[PDB]
Amino acid sequence: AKRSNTSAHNRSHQHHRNIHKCVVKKLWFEKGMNAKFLRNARYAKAGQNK
Amino acid sequence: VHHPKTKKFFCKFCKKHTMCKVSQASRGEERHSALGRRRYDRKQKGFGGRVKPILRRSKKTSKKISLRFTCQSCKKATMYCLGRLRKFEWTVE
């Protein structure tokens, strides 16, 4: 009935077989950030190309 | 807990704050023309007992008190919810 609850013996082993560095695509995260800032950053880009 | 019988509150349709006579919300008794009920009536007929469950192991003795902020300019109710209360009073002062 009463078997083991957990272990961490060879967590380290498995993690290091492969600690891959997940790289970010871009530093801006436009879902976040101020809308009032990003609102103006559109009208900078839109006005320039014309 | 006690609560005011009139207070100021944002009327969603008029788009501004305006004072509104509050009241405790109506738990409606179900009509038998409801589609869900109709399914139940036909399914309950015949043999093979009661069909759908009812909850036997029901512990908690409490209920979230929804109020009904009936507006005076707008004339339209907009339902606010408090937490869960054992008793609910009106303010007399």
Added chain:
Amino acid sequence: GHIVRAQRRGNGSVFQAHTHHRVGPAKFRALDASVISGMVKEIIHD
């Protein structure tokens, strides 16, 4: 459960009357409209 001895008297296999040496059904003659005399031939035990 099994069927109980009170219920089993109905089906009536072994629980029938032992009617072999019984001499006949005890009753009057039928009515048929006065006065009619009738000698006791014998008295018997069934």
Added chain:
Amino acid sequence: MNPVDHRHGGGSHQHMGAPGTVARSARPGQKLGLIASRRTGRRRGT
């Protein structure tokens, strides 16, 4: 008798257990003992 055979049967010690006095409405198998007894016990006087 054991519990399957009769209503009063069974138990470690012999005893009836159930009230032992039953309705006219009670079924075949269930009518055992005193049926619709408007009195019980010693009929003293009356």
Added chain:
RNA sequence: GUAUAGUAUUAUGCUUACCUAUCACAAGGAAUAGGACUAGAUAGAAAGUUUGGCUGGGGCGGCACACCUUCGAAAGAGCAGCGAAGGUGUCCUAAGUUGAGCUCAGUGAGGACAGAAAUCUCACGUUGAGGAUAAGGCCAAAAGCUCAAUUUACUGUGCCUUUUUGUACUAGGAUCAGUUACGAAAGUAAGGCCUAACGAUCCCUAAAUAGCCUCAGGUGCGUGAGGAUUGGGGUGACAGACAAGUUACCUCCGGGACAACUGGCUUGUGGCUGCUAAGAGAUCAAAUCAACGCAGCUUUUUGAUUCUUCGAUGUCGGCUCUUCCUAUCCUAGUGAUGUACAAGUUGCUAAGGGUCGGAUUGUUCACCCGUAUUAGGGAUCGUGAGCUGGGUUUAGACCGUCGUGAGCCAGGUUUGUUUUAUCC
């Protein structure tokens, strides 16, 4: 069906329907019995099914099953147990929001009645008070206390953290787009100083001054229904079946993943022995006892554990026979003495020999009567193809307590199958 009295329905006559009647009577009852369909009521007569999980075996006890605080946790991250100490299923229109003013707990001295405690005054006062409650942080022209005005405990969509080796809900956080409150203002407010106070689909239900889409021949007309969007009704086993027992009449699947049983490790408990002496012992610690302490040995007691055995190592005692250990009661030999003799108490070497007849009890053990003076143990708690079967432990049956009942009970009593050697 029918005739007549009275308040379409009540009453009591009629027989020919129908019915009991005997298969054949003849009467008597009567628009009723009974049957047919629907509705309600009824504690197992009968059927179907259920009767969680965790757990140093299971049961009983408990909730460590959802959440929160401190410690364990080893100064990053992380870390288990029926590990330690607790808490939550709420409370509050103010105990919320804002602005202003003030400082608390306590100690010291004073002050009519005034006392250890009433109200008043000054002085010191780093926060030990208080902040709804658990525990830990945090806070002094405040987050505390008081006064005043108030409703931001507001509406709408994304985003982030707890948590992604598993995405959710709960809770919290930063914004945008509104709108109000308060303040001279900068600003602050999206509840309570911060960490717990709670919940899916389906179904129902509420929100719209009565709105947005659909009802398939009508760009149809009332009723009614169905949708999309936002809350509530609830699952504490808290990612959420709707659910009581008993079996010694029991069955099956498997399990040494897990108990009873021999062995193993361990020695608390039991037994045996040292070291020290604080005194008993007339006097005198050490002839003989030995406290309060401290250190060991033993596996002849019982625990603790779960390594072996569940496709079976035949389980208690007695009877019968063997051998072994010494921590020696007697016999052999020796030393001490509170050793005159005798009987004793006590130390050392010695296991060759001896260690018993009976009453009750299933007994082991115990306890008496009697004798040649009189120790205790081991070998699968030696020894069941060597016996016996009294006990323990099946199915029959009785008593007592418990249970509504089936049934239960290191509670008692009685009847109850003991197989095979010819193999090495």
Added chain:
RNA sequence: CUGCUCAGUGCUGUGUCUGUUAAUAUGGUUCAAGCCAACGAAGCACCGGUAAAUAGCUGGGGUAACUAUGACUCUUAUCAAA
């Protein structure tokens, strides 16, 4: 020789006066589906019966002239009796 107890659980009525109650029928209301009434049997509730039905039926202080015991006395048990 078979004491006491009808509270619970049964069963039961020469028992109904009220309260709760289904379909149906009657009544109101809408253009209809429908909705709102009122009515009301048995059963339950209420009131009696029943233990050779099922069951049930005590604990503790003080107290006689030596101590001892407690004739005697005080108090409590459930919706019944001890």
Added chain:
RNA sequence: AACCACCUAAUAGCUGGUUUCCUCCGAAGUUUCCCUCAGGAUAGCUGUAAUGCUAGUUAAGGGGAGUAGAGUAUGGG
């Protein structure tokens, strides 16, 4: 709760078995959720198919901590 045939090769998170060679690589008994603990799903660890054009270490500079030790605020003494 008889026997015979059929539904029926019923179901089993449980037991037992599961047939040639050489060669290269080579695990897991751990997280979350489950009437979940003799079982599953999900991630991990492993193999294979590929396809595009640094670090399981130290140094140097700079943040974080309240364990070991040590010691008239709270506690014990």
Added chain:
RNA sequence: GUACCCGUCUUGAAACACGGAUUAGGGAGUUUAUCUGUAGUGCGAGUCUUUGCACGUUAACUGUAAAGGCGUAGAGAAAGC
């Protein structure tokens, strides 16, 4: 000189764990439907020719009309777009 008995569940088997007296012959990941992904092949905004008809040295093979399938446009509960 060396060498424990194989198979098996297992953290651990030479085990006092279970299966196994000998030999021969039988003896266990197969097939169907609806899909997933990789590789091969043909055509390609197309593609599949089969239900069926016409052929045949006849269950095959060969020829072919038109529908239909999937693809080519999606979001929304839906109206409309």
Added chain:
RNA sequence: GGAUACUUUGAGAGUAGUGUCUUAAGGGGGUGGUAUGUCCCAUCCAAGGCUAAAUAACGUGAGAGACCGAUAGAUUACAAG
């Protein structure tokens, strides 16, 4: 056809059938997949009967094969139900 009860269906405020009670109209009635009344338009005329062909075939009787080759193949290659 209606109300109600049961079985049944993809049929959903009933797809079909059946019991019980109830029961039409015929210048009118049925159907148009959301109950109910109501106004148009469309389309058929129930409650009686007969009828070849295309289609089915684990029974019985009488050429073909990438199948089995006497523990196989049917239980049976033979004095086998």
